[PDB]
Design a protein around this motif. Structure first.
Motif, mmCIF file in Angstrom:
data_model
loop_
_atom_site.group_PDB
_atom_site.id
_atom_site.type_symbol
_atom_site.label_atom_id
_atom_site.label_comp_id
_atom_site.label_asym_id
_atom_site.label_seq_id
_atom_site.Cartn_x
_atom_site.Cartn_y
_atom_site.Cartn_z
ATOM 1 N N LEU A 57 0.831 -1.173 0.000
ATOM 2 C CA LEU A 57 0.000 0.000 0.000
ATOM 3 C C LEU A 57 0.879 1.240 0.000
ATOM 4 C CD1 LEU A 57 -2.784 1.228 -0.052
ATOM 5 C CD2 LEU A 57 -2.973 0.887 2.391
ATOM 6 N N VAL A 58 1.937 1.205 0.797
ATOM 7 C CA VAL A 58 2.910 2.292 0.864
ATOM 8 C C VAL A 58 3.537 2.548 -0.501
ATOM 9 C CG1 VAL A 58 5.147 3.033 1.838
ATOM 10 C CG2 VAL A 58 3.430 1.996 3.283
ATOM 11 N N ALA A 59 3.871 1.481 -1.205
ATOM 12 C CA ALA A 59 4.496 1.574 -2.522
ATOM 13 C C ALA A 59 3.568 2.205 -3.562
ATOM 14 C CB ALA A 59 4.979 0.209 -2.991
ATOM 15 N N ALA A 60 2.288 2.255 -3.266
ATOM 16 C CA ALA A 60 1.325 2.830 -4.183
ATOM 17 C C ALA A 60 1.015 4.229 -3.730
ATOM 18 C CB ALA A 60 0.057 2.003 -4.195
ATOM 19 N N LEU A 61 1.205 4.423 -2.469
ATOM 20 C CA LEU A 61 0.907 5.642 -1.788
ATOM 21 C C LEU A 61 2.055 6.661 -1.942
ATOM 22 C CD1 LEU A 61 -1.137 6.948 0.201
ATOM 23 C CD2 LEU A 61 -1.776 4.676 -0.572
ATOM 24 N N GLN A 62 3.280 6.175 -1.946
ATOM 25 C CA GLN A 62 4.460 7.009 -2.136
ATOM 26 C C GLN A 62 4.571 7.495 -3.592
ATOM 27 O OE1 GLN A 62 7.827 3.558 -3.031
ATOM 28 N NE2 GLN A 62 7.584 4.232 -0.925
ATOM 29 N N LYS A 63 3.934 6.781 -4.515
ATOM 30 C CA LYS A 63 3.995 7.162 -5.923
ATOM 31 C C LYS A 63 2.851 8.094 -6.279
ATOM 32 C CE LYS A 63 4.053 3.064 -7.720
ATOM 33 N NZ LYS A 63 4.065 1.981 -8.724
ATOM 34 N N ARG A 70 -3.173 15.418 -3.161
ATOM 35 C CA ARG A 70 -2.005 14.677 -2.732
ATOM 36 C C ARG A 70 -2.339 13.807 -1.549
ATOM 37 N NH1 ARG A 70 -0.847 20.395 -4.303
ATOM 38 N NH2 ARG A 70 -0.051 20.679 -2.161
ATOM 39 N N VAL A 71 -2.027 12.551 -1.672
ATOM 40 C CA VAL A 71 -2.250 11.573 -0.640
ATOM 41 C C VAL A 71 -0.911 10.895 -0.410
ATOM 42 C CG1 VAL A 71 -3.621 9.561 0.063
ATOM 43 C CG2 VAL A 71 -4.584 11.164 -1.595
ATOM 44 N N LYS A 72 -0.445 10.860 0.801
ATOM 45 C CA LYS A 72 0.861 10.310 1.074
ATOM 46 C C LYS A 72 0.896 9.661 2.441
ATOM 47 C CE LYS A 72 5.630 12.098 1.779
ATOM 48 N NZ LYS A 72 6.428 10.931 1.345
ATOM 49 N N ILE A 73 1.782 8.720 2.589
ATOM 50 C CA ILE A 73 1.962 8.018 3.817
ATOM 51 C C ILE A 73 3.044 8.643 4.661
ATOM 52 C CG2 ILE A 73 0.907 5.768 3.505
ATOM 53 C CD1 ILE A 73 4.534 6.716 2.430
#
Length: 135
Positions: A57-63, A70-73
């Motif tokens: 999820l992070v790997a999709a969220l960081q991109k 903007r949505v980010k972890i």
């Protein structure tokens, strides 16, 4: 009423700027400037019982660098909602999305006493009609 309706001898001359004259002005509207706070910047923490569920999820969220929303972890961890992690939630405004993980009994308290409600186990919370004592 208007006193004396006659000829307006204004277009008898050459037409340049300051056409209004006296009440004339070139630039009077001062700038406020643009500011992207419309969509807001959505921060969150990802938690799941499977570590790579968080990482995926992070790997999709960081991109997420899409223009507009903007949505980010801010944080990722393999665990359930713990009191210590909730303090990050209200810090970075990142809420904890837990995947069926659930909190501590004190963390669930802490969350809310920390201005951050946590969402997890969202299979179905049947808020639609209490079917009993209902007619």
């Amino acid at each position: 009423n208007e006193f004396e309706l006659g000829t307006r001898g204004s277009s008898r001359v050459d037409l340049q700027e300051q056409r209004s004259v006296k009440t004339r002005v070139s630039l009077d509207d001062l700038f406020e400037q643009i500011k992207q706070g419309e969509m807001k910047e959505l921060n969150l923490i990802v938690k799941a019982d499977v570590q790579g569920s968080v990482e995926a999820l992070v790997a999709a969220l960081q991109k997420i660098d899409v223009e507009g929303v903007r949505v980010k972890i801010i944080h990722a961890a393999v665990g359930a909602i713990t009191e210590s992690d909730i303090s990050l939630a209200t810090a970075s405004n990142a809420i904890v999305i837990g995947f069926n993980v659930r909190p501590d009994a004190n963390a669930k308290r802490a969350a809310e006493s920390e201005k951050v409600d946590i969402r997890l186990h969202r299979i179905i919370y049947n808020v639609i009609e209490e079917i009993e004592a209902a007619m």
